[PDB]
């Protein structure tokens with residue numbers, strides 16, 4: 431047999447998105463692609479929409495993988511799928527708009543890194559989400575501050591905009607599957623905490639040519655000024671930034687670590703997003 435133009439479970443090809451969704455503007459960009467802000471026709475709910483110019487039905491089948499993953503990952507600390515449409519020769523993906531901004535953009539505008547209680551909340555929530563991702567046998571593979579988006583309410587939304595300062599050593603060294611692929615996120619998480627503490631990641635100052643080398647041959651990175659930080663934090667990094675994927679701890683194991691195991695309030699991150707919000711206009 432052979433199938434032509436299959437009907438995908440979370441996609442509607444029988445309806446224009448412009449019936450439901452009003453294009454309000456361009457949400458900036460990098461080298462990611464073409465993303466747009468949009469308003470709901472019935473409710474006025476804000477959302478972000480990306481559009482891809484798919485030539486063939488073989489291409490379309492590739493790009494919908496992102497939709498299948500987004501749909502199956504319904505969790506309080508992960509971007510949330512609202513819908514997908516395939517109209518004309520354009521695939522539309524939409525998720526709930528995030529008005530806090532990426533954690534790195536927050537750091538840029540304040541010209542300062544996060545405080546420790548700020549880092550603790552991000553860490554605990556990132557951990558809750560990774561534990562869920564690994565629950566579904568899904569690996570992120572590109573964790574960094576730029577993929578941590580913020581709401582005004584105080585909670586993160588984990589994203590992925592699909593140079594390698596956050597790459598795990600076993601992945602740097604690889605020349606070719608393995609039972610400890612999920613662990614690579616845990617290295618990247620650790621590098622993300624240092625990025626959040628010091629604005630930039632380790633080895634930021636080097637020729638990018640040298641970065642894979644440096645990561646392969648160096649001892650795990652540590653905080654530039656340990657005295658400024660808690661013992662719980664330094665210890666957390668030490669066991670998270672383990673070069674052996676086999677002895678590196680799971681997301682679940684770290685949740686029990688005293689650096690995050692008593693964090694219940696999201697307050698410090700509510701307070702953070704507000705400062706950033708207040709300095710947008712002045």
Ligand SMILES: Cc1ccc(-n2nc(C(C)(C)C)cc2NC(=O)Nc2ccc(OCCN3CCOCC3)c3ccccc23)cc1
Nearest residue numbers: 478479480496499503509523525527528588589590591592
């Ligand atoms: C191949 C592939 C497969 C899966 C993914 N993938 N995996 C995840 C998990 C792991 C977190 C569940 C998430 C994603 N994808 C994303 O999070 N992708 C996106 C990033 C940034 C965006 O917009 C910019 C930000 N914008 C403005 C602020 O408010 C939020 C929206 C997006 C706008 C609309 C639709 C998707 C967007 C990625 C790639």
